[PDB]
């Protein structure tokens, strides 16, 4: 049930405690590291569920080669490698369980796929914006919004942005009709409808 805070990492590359984890709650997005810099998160999770396949890539000698992130105040469980090693060595279902969770992180990728690296930094920003509202969204009146307390430029990691998050989104916030903000909130009005 391990966890951290809204501003932390789960780990680095090079760090050999690589066994399948179990994000018990909160996203705990993982920020895959890079040489000079720029870290996707890519990974982003739910109740109960796993992340950080490590003793699994280059066997149990795999180097994460991807720094991690305690994105929101974490909540994350884990299990002795055996669970995905010995306990997994047993009936497929056991491994399948981990594989199903892996398939979640995989599905995640497909979700980023297409939506990410689409083309425009606005359409793309929305291509997964609605997706986001489907992930940690908060439905309320207007419609299925998120609400999470966020940047303009974490956002930029959404595009490679500079002021688009605080400028373009303002459009959707009002000029364009799609969301609204409470100091640092998101009110996705809608799944499609106006702004589509």
């Amino acid at each position: 049930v391990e966890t951290f805070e809204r501003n932390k990492t789960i780990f680095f590359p090079g760090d050999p405690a690589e066994r399948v984890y179990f994000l018990l709650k909160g996203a705990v997005k993982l920020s895959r590291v890079y040489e000079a810099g720029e870290e996707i998160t890519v990974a982003l999770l739910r109740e109960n569920s796993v992340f950080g396949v490590l003793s699994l890539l280059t066997g149990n000698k795999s180097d994460r080669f991807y720094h991690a992130v305690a994105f929101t105040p974490v909540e994350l469980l884990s299990a002795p490698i055996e669970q995905v090693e010995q306990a997994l060595k047993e009936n497929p279902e056991l491994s399948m369980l981990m594989l199903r969770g892996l398939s979640s992180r995989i599905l995640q990728t497909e979700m980023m796929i297409e939506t990410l690296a689409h083309r425009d930094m606005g359409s793309r920003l929305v291509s997964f914006l609605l997706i986001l509202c489907r992930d940690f969204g908060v439905p309320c009146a207007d419609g299925i919004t998120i609400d999470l307390k966020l940047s303009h430029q974490a956002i930029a990691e959404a595009i490679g942005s500079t002021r688009v998050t605080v400028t373009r989104l303002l459009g959707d916030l009002r000029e364009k009709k799609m969301i609204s903000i409470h100091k640092k909130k998101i009110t996705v009005h809608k799944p499609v409808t106006l702004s589509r």
Binding site: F12, G14, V33, Y34, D63, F65, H67
Partner: protein
Amino acid sequence: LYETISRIKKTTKLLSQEMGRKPTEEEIATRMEMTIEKLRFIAKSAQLPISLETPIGKEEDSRLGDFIESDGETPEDQVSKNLLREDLEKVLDSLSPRERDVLRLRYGLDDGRMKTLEEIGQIFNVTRERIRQIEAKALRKLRHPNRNSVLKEYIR
């Protein structure tokens, strides 16, 4: 407190009368008005120190206190550290020597923890939009394997 202690002693002796060796404590607290936490505190609180040199015992060969150390630290730690210093130093000191200054200015590597970006921004060359950028830049740079993987073992 001296009196309170004594008063406790007498009152507890009364308990002892009924409950031999007054094993009661928190029950004695029904008559002690306070968790044994302070009762035991009182116990230690009412301790008289030891010569530091009572001759040890089982042998008159030596005093006491001659088997401990001062507030000082063994070189073993000293050095390790000081390694850290330089280890770092170079390892930092191999990416943007100017920025490296602020790395030590807005942080340590000397004798400030600190020079609040504010003061620091202008300290090196008067700046507002060139600081937390190169700040993170520096970290993430010396971060990630091959870079941070040098303190990975010397995490001191």
